[PDB]
Design a binder for this molecule. Sequence first.
Ligand SMILES: Nc1ncnc2c1ncn2[C@@H]1O[C@H](COP(=O)(O)OP(=O)(O)OP(=O)(O)O)[C@@H](O)[C@H]1O
Ligand SMILES: Nc1ncnc2c1ncn2[C@@H]1O[C@H](COP(=O)(O)OP(=O)(O)OP(=O)(O)O)[C@@H](O)[C@H]1O
Ligand SMILES: [Mg+2]
Ligand SMILES: [Mg+2]
Lengths: 538, 552
Amino acid sequence: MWRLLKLSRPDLPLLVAAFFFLVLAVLGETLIPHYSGRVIDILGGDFDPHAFASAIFFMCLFSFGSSLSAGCRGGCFTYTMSRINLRIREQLFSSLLRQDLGFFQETKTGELNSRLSSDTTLMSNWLPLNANVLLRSLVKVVGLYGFMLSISPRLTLLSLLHMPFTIAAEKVYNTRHQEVLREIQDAVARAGQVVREAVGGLQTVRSFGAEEHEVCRYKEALEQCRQLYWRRDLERALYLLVRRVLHLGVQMLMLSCGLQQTQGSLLSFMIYQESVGSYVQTLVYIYGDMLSNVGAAEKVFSYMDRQPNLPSPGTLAPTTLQGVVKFQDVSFAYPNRPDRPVLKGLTFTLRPGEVTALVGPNGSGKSTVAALLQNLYQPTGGQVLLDEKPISQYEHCYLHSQVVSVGQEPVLFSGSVRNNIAYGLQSCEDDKVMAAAQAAHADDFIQEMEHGIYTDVGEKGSQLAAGQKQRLAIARALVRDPRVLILDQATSALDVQCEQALQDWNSRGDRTVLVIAHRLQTVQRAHQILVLQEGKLQ
Amino acid sequence: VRRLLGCLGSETRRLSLFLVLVVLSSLGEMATFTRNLTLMSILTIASAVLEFVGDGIYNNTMGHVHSHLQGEVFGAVLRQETEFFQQNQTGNIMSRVTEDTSTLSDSLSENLSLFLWYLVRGLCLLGIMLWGSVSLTMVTLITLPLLFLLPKKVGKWYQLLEVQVRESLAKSSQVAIEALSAMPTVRSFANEEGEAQKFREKLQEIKTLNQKEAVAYAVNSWTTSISGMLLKVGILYIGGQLVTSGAVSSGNLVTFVLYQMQFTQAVEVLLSIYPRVQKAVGSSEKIFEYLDRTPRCPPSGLLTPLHLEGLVQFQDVSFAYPNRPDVLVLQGLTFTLRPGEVTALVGPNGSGKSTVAALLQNLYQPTGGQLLLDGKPLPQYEHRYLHRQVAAVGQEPQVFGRSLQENIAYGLTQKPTMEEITAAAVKSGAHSFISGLPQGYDTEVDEAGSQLSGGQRQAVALARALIRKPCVLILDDATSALDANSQLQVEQLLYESPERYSRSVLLITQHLSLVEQADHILFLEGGAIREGGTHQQLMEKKGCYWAMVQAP
Ligand SMILES: Nc1ncnc2c1ncn2[C@@H]1O[C@H](COP(=O)(O)OP(=O)(O)OP(=O)(O)O)[C@@H](O)[C@H]1O
Ligand SMILES: Nc1ncnc2c1ncn2[C@@H]1O[C@H](COP(=O)(O)OP(=O)(O)OP(=O)(O)O)[C@@H](O)[C@H]1O
Ligand SMILES: [Mg+2]
Ligand SMILES: [Mg+2]
């Protein structure tokens, strides 16, 4: 596929070198038979030690040169293929990160990782295992072709004639084969997703004692994959049998012509024709196999060129931001489940230096408001304005530097406490991370850790208590000094004393604060209170 | 190498038939118009049919072997202890289970047939050479083992290199999985570039290893070709000198070298196989370590009593996590849960409450003291029985990517009727919003449960716990995301439901207003119990609990 060759373009010098080495290997292999014939002839009668040593010497010399060239060729092709694999992985993963957040609910993470792991190998692995033997036999096959052409040109033309059903059978086989490969990859992805879900949430599984059920599910997926593999293998074997039968038909056609026809040479001409035909059929089969393998990986190419459902990027990066946020008749419905509105005609204004509290029952749409503020989703009606300009017109890094949120259930990453505080900062000094840890009251438990600020926080923060993880999320928010701060239930896991101590969110009076909570304790001190019920302001 | 061949013991009855077919085909290959035309057609048809049958049998057997191996590896993975999954992260385990086994199976299927075919053909050629001449073929057999010395010396290289390649691939897979999950957090901090840089840093190691693999492949190709050339030329030379002395014949030597040509070709192929076998041995090290690992946790018991009270006794329980055994998280806990009563466990963050909840679920074993359910240790009960009698909600509940009907009924052996699921949803308070969904209880949720709100997810998690009718119920901060109205459901479930007499409840929360009606209150700080008693008793003490309540 021409797209994949364009992707392979940086590897061109290696392919050129490999082609040169292949040419040298063929040219060297042309000479070994000559001197081997002299060795055989001198051994078989008319013995002469002077010629014998010379013939053996040249045989050894050209075998040695051909061996070295072949080894270099093989190394070059292997390295080129591996580099192409790694480039495919890099570009696919880079493309996935760009996508809109709806994409990751339509797809599943285990399937995406299965794509990255598996589908790239199909498109990368163009070459069979035994290709070196196939190449080394080329000169012998050409020599056999020379014999049968001179012995009987007529029957050679009859051999060159293609079989009546050879073309259709190959097309049908390729069309079926590509579809079977695609189905196999889909089944593999589903099994990978099953394993991903089983392993990721294992503590719940063991709490309910449902390991055997997961094992049964995985075994069922494996059975489906096995059935697909068996179907592919059986179809390939049947195609090979049919191709051999067609070759046999062509064979006696010319056997008939040869018997019609120069005496005693039919015993030797048949062998050469059979060998040459087998070699050419194998070459055509390899070409078709490579074509089908590239064709089966179409979903990787699909993910590598999907344009996300996002507005064009934003130029704006002001030197100073006033931090006034305005909602103007905002209506929203999630892209995966439209026609079911969540927010209906919201309109409110947040001003710097004042604390706003948003309250409402479960499912009212408070986290939806928090997500619209951060430009994670686009409103389906109205506008969201920051400093009297649309939120989507600001630069990505600048916007998510000025506007910062603490999520409902904070997610941390495997790595140090220094890397979870100061996540996404290009550079952040020891002093700012300690000041942010002190501001969030996180520093008390950080000293008791074995390696302080350098201690490994486990995967998803699984090696911390809930309140500790919550405080590290608060410190991750505060280390940036945001102009607009959003707190989506930031004190749910904290004890009453730590919750009380953290109430003074904007004592300096220089930033906009939005507080989302259920408890009335954190909403009594707010300047403005907004009540949200069924997606409408009350 | 015997470890790889150990898994093939269940397919001997078929691989022997495949071997018989291949040897028959090899022997057949080695050994008026109407009369001449029919024989060739019959011979070709016989050869094609034999090849077709052999390939079919071999492919079916290899597919069965692959499926069985993958299933066994996953089953062995799921048996490990709880702390095994903190040392190994999700992406690493997934890559080991789903990718190493496939590579091993592919290598085995690609190499076994080639080995058997060329071995049989080499044996046939060796027999023909034995017929041609005895001395020269004996010389060939003498010099043949010298060619395998270089592969034997080098082989450990391929194992050590392939192990590193697999490790780097697993690390890259872990990075990719951890980045692709929790995408809103990456997006909201504009950190896509950091994740891409991490992934590229993992790709660089694989690139560095691939360079070495390519160089080793080229060197091995050189060595194999030179070994074949030397083996051929040595015999050719000794024969060309022996013929001059007249002790042999010209035609016999010509035939012998003509067959020696093909014997050396087969020898070259068999030499080519060995490094691939070493690579395969190297690639399967981790999965076989998984298979042969001994779990560091007591196995399941046998007891499944018909009558169980739900009486839980802690007797001087202390615990320290295996990844940091030097620090004790709990110190000498001693309390009893009795049916028909609610016991509240309160204290600052990081005090160990969730650790107590995890111990009570038999996820970890105490380092000291005893933990008894109705007078007998937890490991004496059968697994699926014990985890029906004891159920918990969890501090940040996790749901799976299935329908709401399956999420509530998760883990049960026999499927409950829709009437029971509706009752559980009503008791947990989740029935109000489920009925509003267009598909009702058949609504599919995403793998992270992100399509639900926090309170809705928590209500589903509570319904999942109630449907089992447990005798011991653990509410680990189950009221965190519930709004004002939904807290009344939990209050009625705890203190007013008519089923409260059949079970004992352990209530863990930071919402101390829910604790006032508890029969017993335990104050846990620093991993040790400081105060205990009812609400009024602790209020009259003016101690830690009173100070915590009077904090505002
Ligand atoms: N990714 C999604 N796709 C579809 N619907 C969604 C998605 N995320 C949330 N919803 C739905 O949108 C509605 C609003 O949810 P949201 O989390 O904004 O409410 P909330 O008031 O913050 O809830 P809570 O108080 O429980 O945190 C709910 O009905 C929820 O199920
Ligand atoms: N996997 C782990 N390995 C090591 N230490 C851990 C692990 N999980 C938790 N801890 C530590 O054990 C202690 C108790 O944590 P735990 O979650 O049980 O406390 P908690 O009282 O429930 O806290 P919270 O009120 O915040 O939920 C803490 O110091 C915590 O960091
Ligand atoms: Mg919310
Ligand atoms: Mg806890």
